[PDB]
Amino acid sequence: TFDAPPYVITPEYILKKFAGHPPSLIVHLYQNHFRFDQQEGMFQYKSPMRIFIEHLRNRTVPHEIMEYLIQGGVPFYEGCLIVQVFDHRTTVPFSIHNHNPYITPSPYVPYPPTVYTVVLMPTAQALHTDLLLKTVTPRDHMELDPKNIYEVEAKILLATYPKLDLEPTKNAEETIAKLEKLAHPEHSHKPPEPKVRDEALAAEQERYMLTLDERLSSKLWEPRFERFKLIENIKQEHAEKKEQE
């Protein structure tokens, strides 16, 4: 038997219960990009990884990278994730006349963070993804035969919600009061809003001056170092093979 969560999970309860334990994730925020603690690269806010920032804003578990999180062995605390957020966010380029200690002078110029802790709550999509991943993960062979999915989900639901409210009401006022009392913060938002839809000479001069430029004309940039990584992989494979011989 395992202790079951309360009806409404709050950051206070989770942070107090699991105090003294390592956080699940650490994220550093910069002016225009972010990264994790052990990540050497970076992610742009305009890249596909904006979903993680959206989930952080909404305090929801990111089910879309569940398999990646599993591969890394990230810890869960009653199905939630504790995340630490570090806030680092808070001449004449392309001129040949600039000086630099490694360059000749040139004759045309005269001469030379706040920290935060947050909690992300689970959702139904997360459980769906968990069961789906278990269905296609080899260990019978497979880790979970589909025909047992309903029983497994029933047992998980039984463990998650051990107590319900099974007391009948006698009139409409009692039902109204019960509905009012049981309201949930995550399901009490509001309905969304309807969806809605001098220098010209300088710009034209620049556009004219960039005529027939193959690459810069189209723009008028997210490096990933894929060729370098391919070279590294091939070099490692060749060296390892040479080890045998």
């Binding site: 950051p11 206070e12 806010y45 630490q84 957020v85 808070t90 947050v118 909690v119």
Partner: peptide, 21 residues
Amino acid sequence: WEGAEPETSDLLNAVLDSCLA
């Protein structure tokens, strides 16, 4: 824990909103 959510939630939300833009 440092920067506990219940008290600093508004500031974190504001900075996240600025980041998303």
